[PDB]
Amino acid sequence: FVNQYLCGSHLVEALYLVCGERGFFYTPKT
Amino acid sequence: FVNQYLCGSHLVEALYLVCGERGFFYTPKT
Amino acid sequence: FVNQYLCGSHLVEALYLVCGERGFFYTPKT
Amino acid sequence: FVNQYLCGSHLVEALYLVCGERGFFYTPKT
Amino acid sequence: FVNQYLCGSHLVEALYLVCGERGFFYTPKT
Amino acid sequence: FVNQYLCGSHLVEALYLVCGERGFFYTPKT
Amino acid sequence: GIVEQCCTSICSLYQLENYCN
Amino acid sequence: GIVEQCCTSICSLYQLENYCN
Amino acid sequence: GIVEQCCTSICSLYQLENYCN
Amino acid sequence: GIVEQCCTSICSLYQLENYCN
Amino acid sequence: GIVEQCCTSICSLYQLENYCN
Amino acid sequence: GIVEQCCTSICSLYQLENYCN
Ligand SMILES: Oc1cccc(O)c1
Ligand SMILES: Oc1cccc(O)c1
Ligand SMILES: Oc1cccc(O)c1
Ligand SMILES: Oc1cccc(O)c1
Ligand SMILES: Oc1cccc(O)c1
Ligand SMILES: Oc1cccc(O)c1
Ligand SMILES: [Cl-]
Ligand SMILES: [Cl-]
Ligand SMILES: [Zn+2]
Ligand SMILES: [Zn+2]
């Protein structure tokens, strides 16, 4: 859905900064 | 190296758009 | 409307990766 | 030699805000 | 709460572009 | 190249995340 | 236009490619 | 607040210039 | 999941760290 | 071209306005 | 990995798709 | 200043917090 799609864009950028070298997994829905 | 730190930030935005519903895994080492 | 304007920001960034070397014209409400 | 590619994604964002409802034209070759 | 949050995220990017040289103070409440 | 200017736009997005409700100051010239 | 088609519903990369030059 | 002022109606670049140093 | 927890309310950086590996 | 114009050096808002419709 | 492959040369979206789960 | 401390070397979130109000 658009609002959540746009929100998820900002989430991954935040994950990138928080997680650093550890990396992260992004699974919006499993 | 800041140059590849910034490149990584752009790569995660691109993964988000290409992977879509499948999500992705982000691990800097390899 | 701010919601539509923020959505627009993200569209031009997606146009930028998809379109590549062909580029694009961006026209808002036509 | 990904420097100009990364610069171009920030240009499109700057174009978006400067042009507003005029919209813009973006062509990266010529 | 989240869409004021997302809006502020874009506000800082516009301030970065318009203010240039000058810099800016960002205060969400006040 | 515009390397410092591009770095700065990433810095501002990270300051936005990190500082939250207290906001921040961005003075590019010093 | 692009706004109407895509701020209303999620557009895939294939649909956005239609707006390329 | 910039948030109160620009989060429901679009603030142009030159209104925003007011919040610069 | 992440979207339901953090697109509905703001997650702090500490909440976000829960998804790092 | 724009990248050659503005990726070598920083374009100002006036130079950027050259590309608006 | 992805950084050494895509930060030295531009990866196409074709190329980024190999990293999607 | 901030560009000097963080544009060649990566600054941690820890470090960036010195620039919060
Ligand atoms: O439908 C949309 C809206 C914004 C960005 C995008 O990639 C798709
Ligand atoms: O009114 C607004 C809201 C968010 C970003 C922006 O450039 C303007
Ligand atoms: O809850 C959220 C959503 C998007 C970005 C963020 O930092 C937090
Ligand atoms: O010369 C530039 C390059 C990228 C963004 C911008 O505002 C100016
Ligand atoms: O090769 C790259 C590097 C960064 C972003 C991107 O879309 C492609
Ligand atoms: O050292 C840096 C430079 C730019 C963004 C950031 O989060 C850290
Ligand atoms: Cl948004
Ligand atoms: Cl960059
Ligand atoms: Zn956004
Ligand atoms: Zn960048």
Query: At F9, phi and psi to the nearest 5?
Result: -65, -35
- Whether residue I19 contacts residue A25, with contact meaning beta carbons closer than 8 Å, is answered with yes
Please identify which residue in the block is written with the tokens 């590996």: I21
Burial of A13 (0-12, 13-18, 19+ CB in 10 A): buried
Length of chain G as a residue count: 21
Burial of E1 (0-12, 13-18, 19+ CB in 10 A): exposed
Residues of A in contact with F13 (CB under 8 A): 13
Query: At I12, phi and psi to the nearest 5?
Result: -80, 180
Q: Are A25 and B28 in contact (CB < 8 Å)?
A: no
Q: Are D28 and J6 in contact (CB < 8 Å)?
A: no
Q: Cα dihedral sign for D20, H7, E12, B15?
A: negative
Nearest in space to I9 (alpha carbons), one of E5, F28, F19: E5
Structure determination technique employed: X-ray
Structural domain including D13 reads 1-30
D9 to C1, C14, I13, I15: CA distances (angstroms): 24, 10, 26, 30
Kindly state if the Cβ of C7 falls inside 6 Å of ligand 1.
yes
Residues of I in contact with E1 (CB under 8 A): 9-10
User: Considering its fold, how many domains does chain D have in total?
Assistant: 1
Ligand 6, atom 1, residue with closest C-alpha: L10
Instruction: Please give the distance, rounded to the nearest whole angstrom, from the Cα atom of residue B17 to the centre of ligand 6.
Output: 23
Nearest in space to C26 (alpha carbons), one of D20, D28, J3: D20
Query: At D11, phi and psi to the nearest 5?
Result: -60, -45
Q: Which residues are within 8 A (CB) of K10 and not within 5 positions of it... i.e. 6 or more apart?
A: D2, D5
What is the CB neighbour count within 10 angstroms for residue E17? 19
Kindly state if the Cβ of C14 falls inside 6 Å of ligand 1.
yes
Q: What is the resolution of this structure in A?
A: 2.0
- Do strands C24-26 and D24-26 pair parallel, antiparallel, or not at all (unpaired)? antiparallel
What is the CB neighbour count within 10 angstroms for residue G20? 14
